[PDB]
Amino acid sequence: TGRPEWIWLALGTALMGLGTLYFLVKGMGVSDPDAKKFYAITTLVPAIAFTMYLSMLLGYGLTMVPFGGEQNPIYWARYADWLFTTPLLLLDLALLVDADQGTILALVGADGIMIGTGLVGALTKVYSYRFVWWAISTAAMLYILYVLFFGFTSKAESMRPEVASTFKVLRNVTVVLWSAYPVVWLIGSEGAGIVPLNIETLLFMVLDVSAKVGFGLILLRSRAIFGE
Amino acid sequence: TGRPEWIWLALGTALMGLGTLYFLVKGMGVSDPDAKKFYAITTLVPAIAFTMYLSMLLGYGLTMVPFGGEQNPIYWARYADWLFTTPLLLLDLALLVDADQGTILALVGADGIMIGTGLVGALTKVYSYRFVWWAISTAAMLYILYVLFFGFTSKAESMRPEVASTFKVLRNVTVVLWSAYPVVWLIGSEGAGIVPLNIETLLFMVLDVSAKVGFGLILLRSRAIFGE
Amino acid sequence: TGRPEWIWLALGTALMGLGTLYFLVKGMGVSDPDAKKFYAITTLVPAIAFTMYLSMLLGYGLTMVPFGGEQNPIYWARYADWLFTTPLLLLDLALLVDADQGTILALVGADGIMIGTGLVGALTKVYSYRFVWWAISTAAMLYILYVLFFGFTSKAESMRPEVASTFKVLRNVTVVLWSAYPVVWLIGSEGAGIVPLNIETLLFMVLDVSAKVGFGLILLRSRAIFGE
Numbered sequence: 001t002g003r004p005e006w007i008w009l010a011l012g013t014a015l016m017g018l019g020t021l022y023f024l025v026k027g028m029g030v031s032d033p034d035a036k037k038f039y040a041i042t043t044l045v046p047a048i049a050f051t052m053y054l055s056m057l058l059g060y061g062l063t064m065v066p067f068g069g070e071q072n073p074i075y076w077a078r079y080a081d082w083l084f085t086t087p088l089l090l091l092d093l094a095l096l097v098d099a100d101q102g103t104i105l106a107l108v109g110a111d112g113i114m115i116g117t118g119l120v121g122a123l124t125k126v127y128s129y130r131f132v133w134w135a136i137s138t139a140a141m142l143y144i145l146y147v148l149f150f151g152f153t154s155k156a157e158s159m160r161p162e163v164a165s166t167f168k169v170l171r172n173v174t175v176v177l178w179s180a181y182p183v184v185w186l187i188g189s190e191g192a193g194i195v196p197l198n199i200e201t202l203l204f205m206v207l208d209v210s211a212k213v214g215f216g217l218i219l220l221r222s223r224a225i226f227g228e
Numbered sequence: 229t230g231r232p233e234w235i236w237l238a239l240g241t242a243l244m245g246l247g248t249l250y251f252l253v254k255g256m257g258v259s260d261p262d263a264k265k266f267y268a269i270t271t272l273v274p275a276i277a278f279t280m281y282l283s284m285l286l287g288y289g290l291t292m293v294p295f296g297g298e299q300n301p302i303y304w305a306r307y308a309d310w311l312f313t314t315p316l317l318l319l320d321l322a323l324l325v326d327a328d329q330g331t332i333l334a335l336v337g338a339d340g341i342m343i344g345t346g347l348v349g350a351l352t353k354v355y356s357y358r359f360v361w362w363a364i365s366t367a368a369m370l371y372i373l374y375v376l377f378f379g380f381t382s383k384a385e386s387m388r389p390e391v392a393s394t395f396k397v398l399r400n401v402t403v404v405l406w407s408a409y410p411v412v413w414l415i416g417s418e419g420a421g422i423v424p425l426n427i428e429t430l431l432f433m434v435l436d437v438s439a440k441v442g443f444g445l446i447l448l449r450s451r452a453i454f455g456e
Numbered sequence: 457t458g459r460p461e462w463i464w465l466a467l468g469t470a471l472m473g474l475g476t477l478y479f480l481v482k483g484m485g486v487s488d489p490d491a492k493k494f495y496a497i498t499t500l501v502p503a504i505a506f507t508m509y510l511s512m513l514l515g516y517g518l519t520m521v522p523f524g525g526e527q528n529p530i531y532w533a534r535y536a537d538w539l540f541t542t543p544l545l546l547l548d549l550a551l552l553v554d555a556d557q558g559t560i561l562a563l564v565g566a567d568g569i570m571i572g573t574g575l576v577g578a579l580t581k582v583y584s585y586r587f588v589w590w591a592i593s594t595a596a597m598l599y600i601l602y603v604l605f606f607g608f609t610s611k612a613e614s615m616r617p618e619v620a621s622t623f624k625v626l627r628n629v630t631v632v633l634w635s636a637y638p639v640v641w642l643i644g645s646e647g648a649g650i651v652p653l654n655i656e657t658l659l660f661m662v663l664d665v666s667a668k669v670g671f672g673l674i675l676l677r678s679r680a681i682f683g684e
């Protein structure tokens with residue numbers, strides 16, 4: 001339940017808060033329109049994560065879900081976080097490669113399904129069913145990764161070489177980090193429970209900070225965010 | 229409760245899933261920007277419906293609401309579905325006639341009110357009050373239908389004849405199908421309960437598949453989605 | 457609990473409904489694209505508020521929250537209202553000064569955090585924690601007010617003098633009214649409880665009608681909404 005993992009929740013809260021402040025201050029020295037958008041998007045991501053990590057730390061974002069004949073602690077606040085932060089991260093990537101509206105909607109929509117079905121799975125009372133939702137959510141994730149490689153990368157090359165290289169790195173970072181989430185879910189408290197909640201929380205914290213703060217540091221330090 | 233109607237929920241799940249896959253594959257042979265948008269929007273609709281129909285089939289999207297001195301089974305997942313799919317359908321229509329941002333916001337906003345108030349009515353514990361919400365939701369629906377005829381049709385004519393004819397058909401399809409929803413709600417388990425949940429579920433399934441898959445088939449088979 | 461304050465909820469419901477109808481009818485005599493947007497945005501605000509005020513009046517938007525060792529009545533419907541109406545009001549201001557996408561996203565995002573954290577605070581079971589959320593929400597509000605003065609006003613001056621003057625008035629109206637909300641929350645039933653729910657409801661009603669209907673009357677009566 002909500003106790004051993006408190007340290008990872010506290011560290012997550014602190015790291016997201018610090019990241020938000022760093023991006024906020026760093027963005028003060030920016031007036032370029034396009035550069036503005038990237039800062040706005042990128043700073044909102046850890047700001048949201050900060051509030052949800054704090055909600056979990058304080059116990060608000062935690063609930064008990066019956067399944068497997070047991071009362072299992074489930075941090076639902078994560079999904080509220082991801083619901084808004086994952087599409088924002090996708091928007092950063094899309095804006096970078098100047099994706100068309102159609103592809104953006106496809107990505108945001110698939111992302112919404114990924115998080116929504118993940119939440120349904122996390123709160124499902126029938127054990128076996130939890131994995132059905134996991135599969136559907138994973139399929140949505142694969143769709144997103146597909147678009148990022150066969151509907152994005154190809155266009156990034158048709159853009160400025162500075163944009164292409166920054167997109168390629170952020171793209172690779174996204175694919176590696178995002179793909180780890182379903183694995184942690186599958187092995188953790190929400191899934192088969194091979195890994196305890198304490199360790200599951202630690203894993204998500206490392207992933208979240210990297211996917212948000214790490215991702216943001218790479219993007220906001222790049223010249224790709226400016227139109228030159 | 230959740231049993232007799234299982235067959236309609238299973239059929240709905242299957243039909244939405246098949247529709248989503250068909251649109252997904254069909255869209256692979258498309259590269260045109262504007263055509264892209266229509267495929268993205270139209271494929272997301274049954275994809276979302278698929279997840280919610282499955283949630284109902286598995287029992288997750290079902291809840292018990294006390295009213296009329298009874299414990300009434302209410303499938304709340306429908307509203308989660310409609311909250312996102314109805315405005316997407318409206319966006320398809322709006323994009324088709326190249327509606328201005330102002331009208332799109334008006335439609336999306338009215339739609340949000342329609343579904344939101346429908347949900348409030350569906351979960352209201354005071355019988356007589358349920359119909360007050362039904363009336364407000366219906367008023368919002370009438371607003372939407374009004375705009376589609378006196379704020380859309382008139383412009384579709386000012387566009388390409390291919391767009392005008394496809395819009396006219398989809399418009400007519402929308403008006404006929406959407407108008408049936410409040411009637412089913414009024415006579416079904418959420419309303420006066422003249423029709424049993426089993427039959428109510430069947431009716432919504434026929435309406436949903438037609439309004440989503442049927443609607444999509446007409447749109448995506450049209451040349452109106454391309455700019456020529 | 458839900459009784460003495462019924463009159464303020466009924467008055468709020470009536471005033472929001474009347475405002476919505478007035479804006480609806482007034483907007484009929486408009487065809488200008490940009491003018492359209494302002495009417496669509498501005499009419500949706502009181503329309504949404506109307507539904508939520510009615511939900512509170514009927515008892516649906518009310519819930520009991522345990523804290524301070526007591527069962528405290530909390531009208532959660534307010535946050536559902538504000539979640540959608542505050543960013544819409546910000547959009548009116550942003551459209552007026554032709555703000556760039558980056559700033560709009562920053563405002564909408566900060567607003568989402570403001571309302572979200574306010575809701576978390578309103579439903580928190582640990583008394584002292586409620587004020588932590590209040591502080592975070594207030595910080596988000598201050599960010600919004602900052603942008604409206606150092607990221608908006610400066611640009612409004614670079615626009616038509618009619619737009620600048622209307623923005624300045626609406627800006628001032630927004631800053632004064634919005635700043636009162638955290639104070640009412642802090643002194644009312646959601647906070648330290650120095651003011652009874654009855655009076656708290658009255659205060660929010662006066663603020664809401666002014667910030668929505670009053671704000672709208674000023675905007676929609678202005679020539680600033682037209683491009684000339």
Ligand SMILES: *C/C=C(C)/C=C/C=C(C)/C=C/C1=C(C)CCCC1(C)C
Nearest residue numbers: 118134137138141178181182185211
């Ligand atoms: C800041 C957070 C980030 C970048 C979060 C990313 C989350 C995902 C890619 C989550 C994916 C999931 C699945 C593919 C299946 C099971 C449910 C989820 C939600 C863990």
Ligand SMILES: *C/C=C(C)/C=C/C=C(C)/C=C/C1=C(C)CCCC1(C)C
Nearest residue numbers: 346362365366369406409410413439
């Ligand atoms: C895929 C789903 C579609 C096109 C659904 C459409 C739903 C409506 C037009 C629903 C309308 C309702 C009312 C007018 C009043 C009562 C509540 C609703 C939600 C059944």
Ligand SMILES: *C/C=C(C)/C=C/C=C(C)/C=C/C1=C(C)CCCC1(C)C
Nearest residue numbers: 574590593594597634637638641667
């Ligand atoms: C129609 C409603 C309007 C313009 C509402 C405005 C609401 C705010 C500025 C609310 C702010 C809050 C805080 C700064 C802290 C405590 C929580 C709130 C939600 C009362």
